[PDB]
Amino acid sequence: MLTEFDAGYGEQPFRDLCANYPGAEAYDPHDFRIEWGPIFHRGRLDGSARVLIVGQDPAQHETIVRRILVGTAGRRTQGFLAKLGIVQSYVMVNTFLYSVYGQSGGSKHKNEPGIVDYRNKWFKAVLGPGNIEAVVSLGGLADEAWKAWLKSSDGAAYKTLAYQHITHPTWPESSAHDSATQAANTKIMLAKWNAALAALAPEVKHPDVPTTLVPYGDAFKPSELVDIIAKDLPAGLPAWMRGDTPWAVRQGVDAAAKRRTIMITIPDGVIP
Amino acid sequence: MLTEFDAGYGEQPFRDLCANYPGAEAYDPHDFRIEWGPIFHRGRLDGSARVLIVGQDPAQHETIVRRILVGTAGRRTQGFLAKLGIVQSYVMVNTFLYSVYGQSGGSKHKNEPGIVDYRNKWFKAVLGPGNIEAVVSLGGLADEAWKAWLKSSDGAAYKTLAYQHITHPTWPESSAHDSATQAANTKIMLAKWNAALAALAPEVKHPDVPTTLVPYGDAFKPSELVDIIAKDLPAGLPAWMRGDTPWAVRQGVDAAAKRRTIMITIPDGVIP
Ligand SMILES: O=c1[nH]c(=O)c2nc[nH]c2[nH]1
């Protein structure tokens, strides 16, 4: 009858990190959805994490759960980790605290000191315990974020740490709308992902589950889409918030109204 | 620029309480909104609480914030405590972990062992430090909840503790729709609230701010409506979620759709 949960940011240095976060002085209130407040991480902050994930920016599901990467992008990432034998021993952090409000106008402010400095503080903290043995960045901006981190004083000691830059999980659906082109690019992604998994498997010497590598096909299998674990969510959040069915979307008659609203809908089958 | 927050349930005995909570085996899944998961509390759990508030059941605002009494009822309660000099030294718990559906019935189940046993555990925990000097129940069901606690072995030792049953803060708008009856019923409530404050002022000997009691008039004044404090909310939640303007409602084309959906709308003025 036991249900696990994440108990948040009560221990240092995370406690101070979450009380002194940057707002409109670092993140432009127009090009960033700072109106929803910062979503900080996902995963273990007790030091048991073995792989670090660097994502890009949060979406609307994350805006409700208050943990990053809990949508479709997250479930694809869970399956990627599962292939390495990693089931719970991970920590994820985003390139941006807030969501980009574009227009994909994310790279417009990638050089803001107030933004990079604060992210580096989170990198310094999660890497501090020295237990991370692999780092994976999602997309090109996370890639630039990690590489800019290794060029800083505090991060210079991680140039040797196993690292793979892979394509952002939502690239196929972001690059085209036709199911045909989307399916073709997915095959291209899964092929590139297979190359990264082969390079990381020998570096991950402490998996939650010993696992022989099984590569992706041309398309995703349902088993390669893994639900977020209960242990990642705050206390009390229902099981369907970490299920396979979408439940949050932005809704508005125009752009101004759509930005101001998130609609939450419980999947069918929960309520008798 | 420091923003405080509640870091949840990482310390015992609360950690185990939030990992082993009751579901459909104690709360009937039709007469209770268990689909949204449990909302546990609001306030201090470090032992600095001086006043215990016992509420009834959570609403749609609480379902997003994941703390109880953050809606209009909560803001009226804040102002009630503010008159006793209490600004942050409090802890609040609901009679039910979930929000009844309806209802109609709403009290069919007030005596279910699976419900009361678990609530008593939360009572025992918050009261353990022996720092609570006054208890206030909201509504008739919260009143019976406290009385059921005093009839238990572990709770018999609190029959001596100063206690006041006041009317549930959202009763006037619950009793009638015409603004005339609402204003009339409010006057009756504020009269009963003033009666409770007269009885509790000498019992609250450890206020965060020494304050001379100012009784209510015939209607609520803007100053007697106090916004929930940042320290009560999880890390990252934006300031407007603890503002004076409603931003959450259940909405649907029929009863079934309304139960499955919550609408979140950012107040005007937040986004530039
Ligand atoms: O937290 C997130 N990080 C991401 O990189 C991303 N992409 C889509 N959705 C996302 N959520």
Ligand SMILES: O=c1[nH]c(=O)c2nc[nH]c2[nH]1
């Ligand atoms: O947490 C809550 N407890 C209550 O008793 C209540 N009444 C209205 N809204 C409420 N929220």
